[PDB]
Amino acid sequence: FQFIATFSTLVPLVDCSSVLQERNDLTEVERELCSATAEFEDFVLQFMDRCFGLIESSTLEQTREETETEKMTHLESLVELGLSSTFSTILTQCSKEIFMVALQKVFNFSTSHIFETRVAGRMVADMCRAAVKCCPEESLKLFVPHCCSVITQLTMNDDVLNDEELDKELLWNLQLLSEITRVDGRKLLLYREQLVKILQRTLHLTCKQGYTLSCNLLHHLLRSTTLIYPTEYCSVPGGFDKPPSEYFPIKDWGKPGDLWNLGIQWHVPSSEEVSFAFYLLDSFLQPELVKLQHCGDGKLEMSRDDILQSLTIVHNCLIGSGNLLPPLKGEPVTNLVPSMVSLEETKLYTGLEYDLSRENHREVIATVIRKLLNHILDNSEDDTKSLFLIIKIIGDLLQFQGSHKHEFDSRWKSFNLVKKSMENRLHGKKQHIRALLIDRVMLQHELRTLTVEGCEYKKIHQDMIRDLLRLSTSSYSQVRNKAQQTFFAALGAYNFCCRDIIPLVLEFLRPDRQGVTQQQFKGALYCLLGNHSGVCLANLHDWDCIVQTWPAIVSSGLSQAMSLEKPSIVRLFDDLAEKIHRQYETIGLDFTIPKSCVEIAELLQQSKNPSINQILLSPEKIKEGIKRQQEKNADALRNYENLVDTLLDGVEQRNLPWKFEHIGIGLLSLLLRDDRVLPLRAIRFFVENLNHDAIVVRKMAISAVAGILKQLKRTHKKLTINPCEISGCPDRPDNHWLHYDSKTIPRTKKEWESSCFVEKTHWGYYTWPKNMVVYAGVEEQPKLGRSREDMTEAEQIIFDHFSDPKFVEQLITFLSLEDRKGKDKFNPRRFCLFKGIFRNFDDAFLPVLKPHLEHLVADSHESTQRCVAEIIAGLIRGSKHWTFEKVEKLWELLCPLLRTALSNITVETYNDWGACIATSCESRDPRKLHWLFELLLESPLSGEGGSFVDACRLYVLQGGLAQQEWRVPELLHRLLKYLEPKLTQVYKNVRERIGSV
Amino acid sequence: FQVEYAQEAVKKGSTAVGVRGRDIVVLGVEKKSVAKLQDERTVRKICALDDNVCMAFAGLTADARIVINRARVECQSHRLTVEDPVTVEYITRYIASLKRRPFGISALIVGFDFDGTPRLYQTDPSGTYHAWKANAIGRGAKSVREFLEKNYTDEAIETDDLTIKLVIKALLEVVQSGGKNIELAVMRRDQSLKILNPEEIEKYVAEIEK
Amino acid sequence: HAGTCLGILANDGVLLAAERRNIHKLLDEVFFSEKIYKLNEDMACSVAGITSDANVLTNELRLIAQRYLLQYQEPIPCEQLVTALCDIKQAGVSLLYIGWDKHYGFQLYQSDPSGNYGGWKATCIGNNSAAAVSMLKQDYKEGEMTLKSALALAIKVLNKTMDVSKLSAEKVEIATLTRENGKTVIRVLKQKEVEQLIKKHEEEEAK
Amino acid sequence: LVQIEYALAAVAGGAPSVGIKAANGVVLATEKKQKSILYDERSVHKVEPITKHIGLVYSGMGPDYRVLVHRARKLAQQYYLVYQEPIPTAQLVQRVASVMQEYTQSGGVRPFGVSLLICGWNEGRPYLFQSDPSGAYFAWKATAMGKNYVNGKTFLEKRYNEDLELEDAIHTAILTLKESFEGQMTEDNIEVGICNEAGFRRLTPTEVKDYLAA
Amino acid sequence: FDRHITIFSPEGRLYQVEYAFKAINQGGLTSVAVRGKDCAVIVTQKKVPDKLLDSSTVTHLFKITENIGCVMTGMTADSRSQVQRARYEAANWKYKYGYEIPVDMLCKRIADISQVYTQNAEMRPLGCCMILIGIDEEQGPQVYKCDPAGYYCGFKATAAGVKQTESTSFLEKKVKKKFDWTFEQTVETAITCLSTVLSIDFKPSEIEVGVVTVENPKFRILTEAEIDAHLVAL
């Protein structure tokens, strides 16, 4: 099908025998083509006799006597569309002499048989639909007289209005008529008094397939008479049929199909086709709306299936004639976002006037439903299939103009599948075929029919979404799932609706509510959990929305009708919390547009080439805009610090479940900001929750207090080095004017200052920067040893906990647990906890950690050796800006401490120590840690105990020397001089280290 | 192909060292840590096969417990038909032929073979087996075997000094300071299989530290 | 992960603590053996699986527990019943095993689905196991544990792993296995005794 | 577990069946439509007895049900030959769901496309179970399978109250099939079976028409 | 690989069972059965595709027992195989239970054999369907039908083969207006059914008719001149 449709959109299928006479235009190769065109009719007729056996051997077998397979499968739906494509392209690219001899092959097949209307019903009638879309005159002369003369024979003869199962030939000839009447709607005005006659007789049947084939008849008649669409898709604009023998057809086989002078033919609805489009709407919508009106008022009391049958008529008249129907009116205001500039909705003339004076049928349906839906949800809450149709109508009362939002996306992909397949990339846009280009112009019309960018949130839209919100929270999960998808699609369309509906949807989540069902409750949490790609309604990007949704999740739980024993609701909160942490992104507090936006004044003024807007004024409204921005900057700061207080009042809430505070700490870990400092009650919280019994909370408190200490960092001062002034004299490595960066002899022992410590490794290797910047001298950095007197008296209550020995001894105890025995590594986030402690406080806590450092090193357990190693390396990389007293006082207890630890190194510990002192050598000068490099290079292979210890003692030496990569030539020699006798007499586990060293 | 997947658990399982002496044969394995709340009784890797034969292992502890309780039947189904106890080569050839896919363990089958001769074997997971003076199986087996190649000749003067300055000194090459991380086994000629309690296991390490 | 059964060993008994999980409201609250399946006169078990594959694994353990008793006229030791199923699973659900025998006293085991077991002083299997394995490692006196002190630890670590606002007093299934007057007693504790441990926890932890 | 998930698609395409456990009885109501008037409505039966006191209905594939109704009758008589007592309803479902599991386990054999609803009566207490094609089985107060069973179980949860008698459960079972019937149910279009102290029996169609007058 | 054996589709369908119903339509023939108030008639097409056929050996009506008749529609080699099980299972009932098998229990026996083809992947379904007619001792005439799926329902009138759906609509329409039949003028209902949908009705030696009655329960295939009497009066 892909093969013949890609050939029969290039070559016209026309006989060439009247050109096979005396004519000097034919070359040697071209006369060989024209004689071979005698088999073009023999191709098309043998394509049909091969496709008829492809259909009649693919009819649906009803094997199981209980069920009815009604779905055409995905593999069979492709063969419908694969034969709807590959036959409509043959039969368009085809002469009228070969058409009409092939039209009869379709008619003498599809009317002498009776097909099952499920698989072979959609598949024969699509093959007839191709026969009608190519010549609607000659094809409709014989189908619609045949089908209408046999529906009226087989329906209205007896009393087959009320029935259980229709006759399978009556039920055939509706689908043979319904899927065939969507030709160009001008040439359906010949059959007005035949199509209306059967619609007045088979649309109000009782069989559930009988009226849906009649609703599809009413649908496609309205689709054909109000849409703009191309009627022909041929490769030549005149067609292969209307000038026979006026031009030679075998020249236009490789037609590049020019975009200028395309010759495209359109179907704009005339007033004859539009007044008929309202005459079907004035004879079948309004009689089906007055029966729904008096049923929702209490004065008709229809059956459960009688309402269901009537809504399909309302749905197939709305979805199907929506191009004629204006959207709404009413303009809801006074609660949305106010603006200084225009927020007018965009308007795109998709060509039709729709005079908007007579009826406005879309507003009448919106008033019938709000009475009908108010009756059904109170008087019969069990009628599911009526509620599915009301979701389908409100889904089209709001956002349905002439095209569909998903059918456009599937024709956009089907165009790029066809365009990118057969495209001359050698010479540009000038070789795309005409059948592609006509569809892309139609894809431009269909883009304009769906490009509703701005849409004002009106008062009817305030009511129709809230009626979807009742159906998003109703009794039945089948009804809730379909209603939420319409709810979420209607939240993306209209401007500031999500601020209106968060206060309405969180009313099903408050503890104080008296009667709220479990279907009422979790249906509102599928409204928060957006479960799609369009709108996450609990994780919006505004403070006025996040200050309501995040507390209401934590306020639920502690009291609600929250069945936490049902397993689906537990997966719902675990998805609602795991969508927030995945999707959250930090919100600004200062929208201060800088003074370098004279460009905006140069764009408002003096553009003038299209700019028909003669105002050009802002005398003191720029002061009002600054004032309202500073109020926005104040409220964004205010709603941030109210969000912290409302979560802490919800996590420190009595009688919470445990599963609702892990979400509550989980929403506080996202609020820890860089431009601000976290509020005081949260600094008290995360420090006190370091010692929490739940391992999940205190794993988050480690990740939060490490960020608090980054906020409380005290901003060291810097200065600039000219590297010519030091090193005595003014090219990619190891220069003459680079010798001071290489640690060999002159290491600082007493006069530790005035040494020009370059911290990070890579500086000065290749070249020098314009401004080589190091830290200051002695005591120009901020003061280290201080007490609570000279301190920020609100943000270093963290000082009060690490001085308390009960807090520390419980913190050391929890960190030496085992979260798992296998997956247990050197945590780089407990490291950044202790790096931010000893950097910020400058070993004010190290005398309170005297036993808890010396106890953990003298332990065989790998849990405590891992616990102490994050503290050891955090001491070392916290000792960057320490005075020379505190550095020597650090290593006076630390150099015996590692020699103890490197002695008792184990199998489950050498990756911890191999990432402990290899972490502590990260961005430090090799001057400032020579106590390591005199200890680690002391005796790595002089094995006091065992041989695997000597290999693990050498692997930790490897990562420390590698991390100070080129900054040390000397210790690489001292270790090479060490190994060059020793490398002959070692064992294999040491050889695998010496080779790795 | 399928036997190569067996060996990857031998290289990660705990070490197993055996030497062979003039009068006694000694196994010794690395007792790993279990958990904080795991009773460490059911995780011992020195199993007795009959009264004159025992073996260590390294690999899957599931497939070992199949190998042990199949070799414990062939140690007893031998005595029904032969009335003599197994030679150490008989049960080693039984375990190797027992190893679809081979059972992913490597063992150190030791003991005596009814004439008082000391024996030490190894069933690699390929199905192969051969004799040994001293051997090592497990995670650091290549370096321990290189250590035992250095020390074999004049150690068998005293059966105590043979079997600590080799066996515990070979575990101490790879395993920790000891005492609670060494499970050590020793059997004399036709006496019993005795696993040394850690009150006596720490006794021998103190002589080694001196 | 479906069940939430957890074992705790003490000096004078072992205890299983499973939670009764009821998904839909129209499921019948069965009055039969719900969560703690008694294997023979001195041993019980609990599975981390659906109650259909429970009836296959427990009625296979009961064949092993009675082919032993038919053969030796003694009750089966509480490791050989664990081992014989772990040999069958070696040729797909995790279990716990509480029991008593004359050899190694009160015992607790945990069969992996691969076929591996181990003696535990306290452990968890099923839903949020590592959340409660870690909580037992915080507070368990490994040797200084009385039965009621172990029993208060169970409803402590169950109040931080299952449900909302009541610890599901009618949906938690503590069974204790003790020695009394020579025989062996297995007491699935009643709803009045299971409710008071929630009351003795909510009073002691609030005060 | 791929074919087992696909056999449940064959169950959920099947005809609706509703079971409700009352105080003193169990009701099994189902859909027995015929495609034509040519089908004899009373020739084959969907509600089907196992013992004097156990009956079971299905949703799913017709012929796969008869394999399970032939094994459940053997397993009920292999109990009765040994123990000389009518089989407990709990013990019957354990043996039927072991048979349904036995075809998922062995290869080259597809699972059954059948869920079962198994009523019963033992020791003065009613029983209603449901065996899945996976071999799983669950005790229910009231449930439904077939087409629109998600809508059925939500309909049952609003109209269940454990103090209802057996005559009140026949109404709320036909009212559950009424919601997803799509037609006009006569005495022939449905099949009801009740199980009480007197035993299991499927209702004769003249007895059902009295319940259809409500 | 779920289209080459009898396992489920992701939609829950057995494709080989559905393809086996298409194997019934490959025979090019059509059988029609109908039940009377005291009679049961089956009517087939008897196509003689070669002039060298002994036409006595081309048939689709078969005696199963002395008073249970059959008609097979579909693959001819599969049809003779499924007769042979019905020949066996109806004589095995008489030996094990001492009375003639019902048409109830013979279809349920044959359909339970046919279910095993739809569950084991090592064998295909038989591409043919059986329509058994017979007189019960207490229920009167019975017309039942097995299919390749395994369904064994009971019928007032049924059809099989290429014109199965078209013959059903002819039999539904006559079974709604009246009691669908009376006595052995029920033969005239079935012969019109096979002649309306196939649109030939050429000769009275191109069909095959078999009957069971209350007054004569044995299955007797009508002769050519015996079946010309119903066709000259048609």
Ligand SMILES: O=P(O)(O)O[C@H]1[C@H](OP(=O)(O)O)[C@@H](OP(=O)(O)O)[C@H](OP(=O)(O)OP(=O)(O)O)[C@H](OP(=O)(O)OP(=O)(O)O)[C@@H]1OP(=O)(O)O
């Ligand atoms: O509107 P779509 O579907 O998104 O696709 C647009 C592309 O996206 P954009 O408009 O920027 O959003 C754009 O391509 P890039 O900018 O990414 O390179 C255009 O390229 P351009 O014309 O500038 O480049 P040149 O002409 O190829 O040199 C068009 O590509 P061609 O067909 O090769 O170009 P032709 O339209 O044939 O002239 C294409 O027009 P179609 O609609 O026909 O696919």
Ligand SMILES: O=P(O)(O)O[C@H]1[C@H](OP(=O)(O)O)[C@@H](OP(=O)(O)O)[C@H](OP(=O)(O)O)[C@@H](OP(=O)(O)O)[C@H]1OP(=O)(O)O
């Ligand atoms: O010593 P390190 O572990 O390598 O960390 C340093 C340190 O950051 P911390 O405050 O987190 O310890 C520097 O901070 P100061 O000493 O200058 O106060 C910071 O410098 P900046 O604050 O100016 O960014 C620098 O970052 P950088 O390398 O970009 O200069 C960063 O190094 P890392 O980014 O590698 O961690």
